[model samples]
Target: RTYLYRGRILNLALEGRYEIVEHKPAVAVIALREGRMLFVRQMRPAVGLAPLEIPAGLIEPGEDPLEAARRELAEQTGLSGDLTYLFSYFVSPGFTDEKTHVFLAENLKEVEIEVVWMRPEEALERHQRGEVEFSATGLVGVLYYHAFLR
Candidate 1:
């Protein structure tokens, strides 16, 4: 249905495919401040370019997702915030069973590897116009901001 537009975007972005996989739980944090969305850019050799993304990382063995997400936000962006669990989704699911829990992080402080803070509207426009790209994690965060946070 038209209501599934959100899910369709994700599936299309990752090129939905399926087969045997290994489960890898992960988490990410989306932070917004003063009407600007937090973003970071770093070289990703595999993709051959640095795409903007939110703070994210795989959960360490025996570590709770909340803790892991907080750790990721701290370590990756060198900032901390109040984290609230948002939702979870499977990434790709064709090769690795990587499930990522998303969090809404507010009241950010300390921060960067080319840190970028752009309005959601501009970020989405850049993505739509091919001026910049987004990782799965970042894409979700951008959409989340527009869908629920606004």
Candidate 2:
């Protein structure tokens, strides 16, 4: 066994040999209004491109996932709404311990910022063509919305 400490202590299987990333939980929102989905286009340093994505952020310590979702939605898109819990899942079970809780947001009211609305098929096609970049969390939320919700 091996031990590493930083913000959190990490343990490794000495024999099997695996690395783990201890990460905080996060939340993503699927904001829908008038049959369109609200999305944000921002530059992602990690990916080297600005991608269209759902509003999301880390769940602060002692903060509820729903609250985080609502906060991120407003912070990123300048919109607030009633959020409904959809589901939760690990981002990458092989390495990171980050689990993302997804929510469906409706009855949205603009707070300050501007947002773009896109048809589900148009967004999906753009993503498939590499015209619209997205993270895994955003992709899953969009897919789920089209498959089940919309």
Candidate 3:
């Protein structure tokens, strides 16, 4: 077994091998307004390009996942609304320990933010034209949202 300390969003710690490294609950918001899905074209440094995705973020300590979802929505996309719980599940149980709570946000109210970003129009066009694949969370969120809508 390996012993090490890792810094997380909450700056929490991982105990022994059997203990949890961190309990990260993220919320994926399928923000809808006027019959349109609100999404962002974001640059993911890890992937070296921009991708389309719903708003999401890490869960802070002492904060509810639903609250975290709202915070992420506003911080990332400047959205605040009544959140609807879609579902939640373990991300990958075979290796790491993590969970994410999904949500659908409605009745959005936009706030002023000095900065927010979306992929370039050209890039977004390419992505929509089947030239690129989205990140895992987005793929899953789309699947789950459709299932719930049915």
Scored by TM-score, the top model is: 2
RMSD of 2: 3.1
lDDT of each: 0.81, 0.78, 0.65
Q: How many residue pairs clash in each candidate?
A: 0, 0, 0
Q: Cα deviation in Å at residue 24, candidate 2?
A: 0.8
Q: Give the TM-score comparing model 1 with the true structure, all chains together.
A: 0.81
> Which has the higher lDDT value, candidate number 2 or candidate number 3?
2
lDDT tens digits, residues 24-49, model 3? 56777776554345666566777897
lDDT of 1 by residue, 85-109 (tens): 9999988765556799999998887
Which pairs clash in model 3?
A: none
lDDT of 2 at 119: 72
lDDT score at residue 76, model 3, on the 0-100 scale: 79
Candidate 2: tens digits of C-alpha lDDT, residues 31-91: 7677777777776776898777778888877789989998899888888888999999998
Off by over 4 Å in 1: 1-23
Once all C-alphas are superposed, what RMSD does model 1 give against the true structure? 8.6
> Quick one: how many clashes does candidate 1 have?
0
**TM-score for all predictions?**
0.81, 0.84, 0.70
List RMSD in Å for every model shown.
8.6, 3.1, 5.0
Q: Which ten residues in a row have the lowest lDDT in candidate 1?
A: 1-10
